[PDB]
Design an enzyme around this catalytic site. Structure first.
Site, short mmCIF file in Angstrom:
data_model
loop_
_atom_site.label_atom_id
_atom_site.label_comp_id
_atom_site.label_asym_id
_atom_site.label_seq_id
_atom_site.Cartn_x
_atom_site.Cartn_y
_atom_site.Cartn_z
CE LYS A 1 8.67 13.84 -28.36
NZ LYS A 1 9.59 13.89 -27.19
CB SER A 2 7.25 21.41 -31.34
OG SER A 2 5.94 20.96 -31.62
CB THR B 1 9.81 21.45 -25.47
OG1 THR B 1 8.64 21.12 -26.23
CG2 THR B 1 9.42 22.45 -24.40
CD1 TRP C 1 18.40 22.43 -29.52
CD2 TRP C 1 17.08 22.24 -31.32
NE1 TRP C 1 19.16 22.74 -30.63
CE2 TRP C 1 18.37 22.63 -31.74
CE3 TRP C 1 16.08 22.05 -32.28
CZ2 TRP C 1 18.69 22.85 -33.09
CZ3 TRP C 1 16.39 22.26 -33.63
CH2 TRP C 1 17.69 22.66 -34.02
CG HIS D 1 4.05 20.45 -23.85
ND1 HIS D 1 4.90 20.89 -24.85
CD2 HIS D 1 4.81 19.68 -23.03
CE1 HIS D 1 6.11 20.41 -24.64
NE2 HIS D 1 6.08 19.68 -23.54
NE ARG E 1 10.46 18.42 -35.42
CZ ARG E 1 10.97 17.28 -34.95
NH1 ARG E 1 10.45 16.70 -33.88
NH2 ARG E 1 12.00 16.72 -35.56
CB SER F 1 8.99 13.63 -32.85
OG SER F 1 9.79 13.77 -31.69
CE1 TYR G 1 13.63 19.89 -33.86
CE2 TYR G 1 13.87 19.88 -36.25
CZ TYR G 1 14.20 19.37 -35.02
OH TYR G 1 15.10 18.33 -34.92
CB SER H 1 22.40 24.13 -28.08
OG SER H 1 22.75 24.79 -29.29
CG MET I 1 21.50 19.47 -26.16
SD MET I 1 19.92 20.09 -26.68
CE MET I 1 18.86 19.52 -25.38
CE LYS J 1 17.12 10.40 -38.79
NZ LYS J 1 16.82 10.08 -40.22
N1 LIG Z 1 19.87 19.68 -30.07
C1 LIG Z 1 18.85 19.22 -30.81
N2 LIG Z 1 18.89 19.41 -32.16
C2 LIG Z 1 17.87 18.96 -32.94
N3 LIG Z 1 16.76 18.31 -32.54
C3 LIG Z 1 16.75 18.14 -31.19
C4 LIG Z 1 17.72 18.55 -30.26
N4 LIG Z 1 17.35 18.21 -28.97
C5 LIG Z 1 16.20 17.60 -29.13
N5 LIG Z 1 15.78 17.52 -30.44
C6 LIG Z 1 14.59 16.91 -30.98
O1 LIG Z 1 13.42 17.54 -30.51
C7 LIG Z 1 12.34 16.54 -30.47
C8 LIG Z 1 11.78 16.50 -29.05
O2 LIG Z 1 10.90 17.61 -28.87
P1 LIG Z 1 10.35 18.04 -27.43
O3 LIG Z 1 11.50 18.63 -26.68
O4 LIG Z 1 9.28 19.04 -27.62
O5 LIG Z 1 9.83 16.83 -26.74
C9 LIG Z 1 12.98 15.22 -30.93
O6 LIG Z 1 12.75 15.07 -32.34
P2 LIG Z 1 12.88 13.69 -33.16
O7 LIG Z 1 12.07 12.67 -32.48
O8 LIG Z 1 12.39 13.95 -34.52
O9 LIG Z 1 14.30 13.29 -33.17
C10 LIG Z 1 14.43 15.46 -30.55
O10 LIG Z 1 15.41 14.63 -31.14
#
Ligand SMILES: Nc1ncnc2c1ncn2[C@@H]1O[C@H](COP(=O)(O)O)[C@@H](OP(=O)(O)O)[C@H]1O
Ligand SMILES: Nc1ncnc2c1ncn2[C@@H]1O[C@H](COP(=O)(O)O)[C@@H](OP(=O)(O)O)[C@H]1O
Lengths: 281, 282
Positions: free
Chosen positions: A41-42, A44, A46, A96, A118, A126, A181, A215, A220, A243
């Protein structure tokens, strides 16, 4: 419940101890591999999207026809391990795994890894909303309990603190890039430059624009191929992209929880650079 | 190059000789199992989607939430083997294995299998455009070469002719149902009715409507959970649901190739019922 391996929790489906042992002790890492390392949830996905987009110089055809988990496999997962064990160089994948479960082969390789960190408070939130209606994982009874579990490391992939600590020593290595992040959200264009500089890539203005555009959170979220996770969610109950901002933890942490966390954090992060903690705001 | 096991070609990644060997003399087939058997590109996923919908009573939630290769695992693949060994009955899965490599524990069981055959010409075309870009498998130099390879059986899962001959002997066994892609296309409703009769399943009118609707080409082409497979492709343009019709072969076979193929087919298939040869026509 959780699938435990060397004291670390993993989902109960999609992963096998047998494989984890092989991932760590046998998986071959190649100097041409580009690896995304993150505590769950950092950001990845993205970062993976961005890396794919850097490959396609901005064109979105490829990322919209091939799912993301195929473009950047999750190496310790069954599907990822199986796939990567054969894929042709250069390989792009994510993980991870905390440092003590990572492929030992990596340490004698020149493979480039990008570690994305993050703010743990935002990571916590998250994970809370994401892992909520998810299957094959131990689910907490409430926000209060999840908060407790996170602070103690009894969650998927263990302690954020340990994960951060185990990997930071690699930081000064030539083949290790540290990103947050927060800086990715604040100055995407600048952060993408650092990445291009790290991987030895160059981009034309029009290409960078396409990347920034494709992106983006909304872009996305609307891409079926990228807003696609192979984890089994209880579809009878219920969002990979929630979010996509920074600091949403303030809307969920009570002042009490926030003071406790600052205390726990202040403790654990005592031996690490202050500049490190600054890049998480 | 291919991964050769017992004279048959398999993909380079996702399959291990050690597992293929276990599939044959170790894997346990359960009486409650429902198995899909096909020579690759004969309509495996179409049938799987149908079987899944039959289970879901036409509801599309499940098939749109879980990937198809998870709802109907490929038994001989690394992923499928391990998964099935831990799945609770009733199990639903598929296989492209010719009969000599199929789990021997099956032949003394009561598990029900559905063998789906398709006109080899359409199978050839379908395969040419699907494997064309695919990684982990030997890539043909051209259309002429692929045509040649297919005719000589030097392709994934060997000769279509051998594959058919090895399984036809099961044709009259009670736990064996033979279907043709062409009949499924000609009248899906009727074929599903046959499948229900075979598996002993009844459906309400509205459930059948939803099964037919959701298993139709257009609807299936939209579900990313089903319009995909776990076979890495060197992206180029190679989608699982390409056209979904019968006879597309006439749009690629040269008249010469057609004559050559008709000759080969006629010799190879002489020893089998003409009935079977007719069911493959459009
Ligand atoms: N294009 C983007 N811009 C910003 N945050 C993004 C993104 N794509 C994914 N995320 C955020 O990255 C987190 C998921 O992380 P991971 O890929 O490691 O699982 C989520 O955070 P939030 O739950 O705070 O919205 C998700 O919304
Ligand atoms: N709902 C459906 N209706 C008709 N044909 C379908 C279908 N779903 C898949 N197919 C076809 O089945 C073939 C793939 O078979 P398999 O699943 O064994 O690989 C493809 O043939 P074409 O390439 O001729 O279009 C594909 O389009």
């Amino acid at each position: 419940d959780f699938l435990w391996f060397e004291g670390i929790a993993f989902p109960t489906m999609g992963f096998r101890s047998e494989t984890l042992r092989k991932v760590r002790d046998e998986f071959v890492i190649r100097d041409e591999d580009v690896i995304i390392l993150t505590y769950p949830k950092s950001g990845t996905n993205w970062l993976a999207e961005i890396l794919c987009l850097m490959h396609s110089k901005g064109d979105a055809k490829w990322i919209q026809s091939v799912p993301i988990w195929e473009r950047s496999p999750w190496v310790e997962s069954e599907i990822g391990y199986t796939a990567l064990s054969e894929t042709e160089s250069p390989r792009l994948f994510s993980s991870h795994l905390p440092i003590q479960l990572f492929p030992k082969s990596f340490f004698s390789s020149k493979a480039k890894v990008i570690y994305l960190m993050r703010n743990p408070r935002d990571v916590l939130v998250s994970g809370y909303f994401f892992w909520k209606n998810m299957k094959f994982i131990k689910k907490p009874k409430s926000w209060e309990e999840y908060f407790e579990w996170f602070c103690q490391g009894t969650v998927l992939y263990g302690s954020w603190f340990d994960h951060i600590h185990g990997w930071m020593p690699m930081r000064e290595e030539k083949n290790f890039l540290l990103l947050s992040y927060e800086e990715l959200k604040q100055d995407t264009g600048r952060t993408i430059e650092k990445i291009c500089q790290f991987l030895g890539k160059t981009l034309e203005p029009e290409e960078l624009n396409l990347i920034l555009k494709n992106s983006s959170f909304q872009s996305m979220k609307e891409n079926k191929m990228s807003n696609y996770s192979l984890l089994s969610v209880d579809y009878v109950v219920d969002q990979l992209l929630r979010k996509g901002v920074s600091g949403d933890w303030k809307n969920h942490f009570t002042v009490a929880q926030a003071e406790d966390f600052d205390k726990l954090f202040q403790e654990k992060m005592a031996d690490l650079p202050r500049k490190l903690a600054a890049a998480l705001e």
